[PDB]
């Protein structure tokens, strides 16, 4: 019949939306809300996940449906009443509930955002639902039904075109297909891949092996980590294909003194040690304590013990570890995450354009103390999981530029090449894992 939603998953997915606006990235907050309901049926928490991709990826979208009924932007309001007013919308307009479901939204779903903030929400809520479910959508601009095809603002539809073209419209495709694939690396210093495989289709989980990174997986959730023997050993990691090329293109050896500039949550620094063996050492800067400890969780439990955290700007260093004291070192640089909004579809409307230039700033500046850092036979590579110009070829041409004294180390496999040649770029749509971008330098 139709979409049949029970309290607690009416409960759930608000608590999620309401989670995701404070909590990054959002899969976290998805976890935090369906254990704390007790989703744990599969069927309602494939379908309460389903619901919380279409949300984020048509947040903008759904917004300005709110604005139009509600006479404002739900930015103003109330994060509890901004969260149901969005999942009621989607619900409304594209999922097609069922009575039991309506009415579940009308009551249980009034009542809990009272519950977590004051009667008069839950009844401005209950006020506004049937305007919600007469609401009639109307897209009259050309700007506005271009949006709605490529679900996504038009001052990123326009950014695309102009370093995609033709491609524009498979990229927006590439980046709104649901699928619910979850990508890992396996911990060759704690398992091997079969090993994890069979423990993986012990579960009820569809497995597919990276044919680009053997030791990358692709795993079909939903997948509870924190119940996973496999990732509580420390034998799996979450990262993407994109992420994990990155270290063994950088190509660090056991014995060798590494520098990651950017490390936490630390899914690369982690990948450096692996193919260190386990020796040598990682100096790895971040300026979030509270994402260091997370890199210190992983480093412990997956046997790694040659990686010295240091929680410290990383535009310092010289004069903090050393001048040319790193054999290689990797800036994976922090910045506007534009390739990853297939993985966070909300992202696309949390970005701005301005910041695409203050972000482009920071990586210079890190990329001058990283340059600094290597070795006169060292190497330097940088990457971004952006698709910007202005924070990849951009920032390389400038690069090469002021330095003296690096080179370009021209690269092929495994993805394609980038806008200057010798660097190289991960699509979507091209190669199903995230934007991604590669410059390797060396002195
Ligand atoms: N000036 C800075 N010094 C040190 N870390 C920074 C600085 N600016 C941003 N960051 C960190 O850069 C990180 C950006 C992430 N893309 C790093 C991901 C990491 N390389 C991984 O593979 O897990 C964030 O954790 C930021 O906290």
Not at 326 to 338: E, G, N, Q, R
Not at 399 to 408: G, Q, S
Request: contains cysteine; aromatic residues 8%; proline residues 6%.
């Amino acid at each position: 019949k139709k979409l049949s939603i029970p309290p607690k998953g009416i409960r759930a997915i608000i608590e999620a939306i309401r989670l995701g606006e404070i909590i990054k990235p959002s899969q976290y907050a998805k976890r935090e809300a369906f254990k704390k309901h007790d989703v744990e049926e599969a069927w309602l928490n494939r379908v309460l996940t389903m619901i919380f991709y279409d949300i984020m990826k048509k947040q903008g979208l759904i917004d300005k449906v709110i604005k139009e009924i509600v006479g404002v932007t739900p930015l103003i309001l109330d994060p509890w009443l901004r969260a149901a007013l969005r999942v009621a919308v989607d619900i409304a307009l594209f999922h097609d509930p069922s009575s039991q479901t309506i009415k579940n939204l009308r009551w249980k779903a009034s009542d809990f955002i009272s519950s977590r903030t004051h009667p008069y929400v839950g009844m401005y809520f209950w006020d506004l639902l049937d305007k919600i479910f007469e609401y009639k959508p109307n897209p009259k601009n050309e700007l506005e039904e271009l949006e709605w095809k490529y679900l996504a603002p038009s001052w990123l539809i326009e950014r695309v075109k102009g370093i995609l073209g033709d491609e524009t419209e498979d990229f927006f495709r590439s980046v709104n297909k649901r699928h619910e694939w979850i990508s890992i690396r396996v911990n060759t210093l704690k398992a091997n891949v079969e090993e994890v495989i069979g423990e993986l289709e012990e579960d009820g989980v569809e497995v597919v092996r990276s044919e680009r990174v053997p030791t990358i997986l692709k795993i079909k959730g939903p997948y509870n980590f924190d119940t996973s023997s496999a990732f509580n050993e420390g034998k799996i990691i979450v990262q993407e294909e994109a992420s994990a090329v990155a270290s063994i293109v950088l190509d660090p050896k056991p014995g060798e003194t590494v520098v990651d500039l950017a490390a936490a949550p630390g899914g690369k620094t982690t990948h450096l040690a692996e193919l260190m063996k386990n020796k040598g050492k990682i100096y790895a800067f971040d300026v979030d304590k509270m994402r260091m400890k997370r890199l210190k969780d992983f480093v412990k439990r997956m046997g790694i013990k040659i990686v010295k955290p240091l929680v410290k700007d990383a535009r310092k260093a010289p004069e903090i570890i050393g001048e040319e004291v790193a054999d290689k070192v990797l800036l994976d640089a922090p910045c506007t995450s534009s390739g990853t909004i297939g993985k966070n579809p909300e992202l696309r409307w949390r970005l701005r354009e301005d910041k695409i230039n203050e972000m482009s700033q920071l990586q210079r500046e890190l990329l001058e103390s990283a340059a600094r850092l290597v070795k006169p036979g060292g190497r330097l590579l940088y990457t971004t999981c952006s698709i910007f110009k202005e924070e990849n070829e951009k920032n390389i041409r400038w690069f090469l530029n002021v330095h003296p004294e690096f080179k370009l180390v021209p690269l092929k496999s495994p993805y394609d090449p980038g806008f200057l040649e010798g660097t190289m770029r991960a699509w979507p749509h091209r190669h199903s894992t995230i934007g991604f971008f590669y410059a390797l330098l060396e002195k």
